[PDB]
Amino acid sequence: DIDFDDLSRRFEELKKKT
Amino acid sequence: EAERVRVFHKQAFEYISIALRIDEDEKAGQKEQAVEWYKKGIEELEKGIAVIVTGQGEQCERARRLQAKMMTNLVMAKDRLQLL
Ligand SMILES: [Ca+2]
Ligand SMILES: [Cl-]
C-alpha cells in the first residue's frame, strides 16, 4: 500500500544519487 | 477538518508522484517539468498540513496521521526542489 512514507523513501533514494 | 485534509492529501500525493516519476527517469532534459509538479505538490502539502483538525475521535486521528506523513514528505520535497 503506497503512502506518503513510500514517496519520502523515493526522495531519499534520489538524494543518495546527488 | 478531516474532509479537507483528505482532499489535499490525495491531490498532493498525485502531484508528488508524477514529479518523482519524471525526476527518476534517467533521460535528460525533463527536470524543468519535474520542478513544476513539485511546486504544485508542495502547495497542496502546505495547505493540507495546516488544516485545523479539532477534537479527538477516529476520523480526527486518521487525518492527523495523514498530516504527519505529509509533513515528512514536505521537508524532502523542498530539499529536492532547491537542487533543480
Ligand atoms: Ca506506509
Ligand atoms: Cl499517506
Author numbering:
A (entry chain B): 349 to 366
B (entry chain A): 112 to 195
What does the article say, verbatim?
The SPASTIN MIT domain is unusual in binding specifically to three different ESCRT-III proteins: CHMP1B, CHMP3, and IST1. The structure revealed that the IST1 MIM344-366 adopts an amphipathic helix that buries its hydrophobic side chains in the SPASTIN MIT H1/H3 groove (Type 3 binding). Four hydrophobic IST1 residues, F352, L355, F359, and L362 are shown binding in the H1/H3 groove of the SPASTIN MIT domain. The IST1 and CHMP1B MIM elements exhibit similar binding modes, but with two significant differences: (1) The longer CHMP1B helix extends three additional turns beyond the IST1 N-terminus, and (2) the MIT H1/H3 groove expands to accommodate the longer CHMP1B helix, with a maximal displacement of 2.5 Å at the N-terminus of helix 3.
The 12 related human ESCRT-III proteins form filaments that constrict membranes and mediate fission, including during cytokinetic abscission. Human ESCRT-III proteins have conserved helical core domains that mediate filament formation, and variable C-terminal tails that contain short peptide elements called MIT-Interacting Motifs (MIMs). MIMs bind cofactors that contain MIT (Microtubule-Interacting and Trafficking) domains (Hurley and Yang, 2008). MIT domains are simple three helix bundles, but they can bind MIM elements in at least seven distinct ways, which we have termed Type 1–7 binding modes.
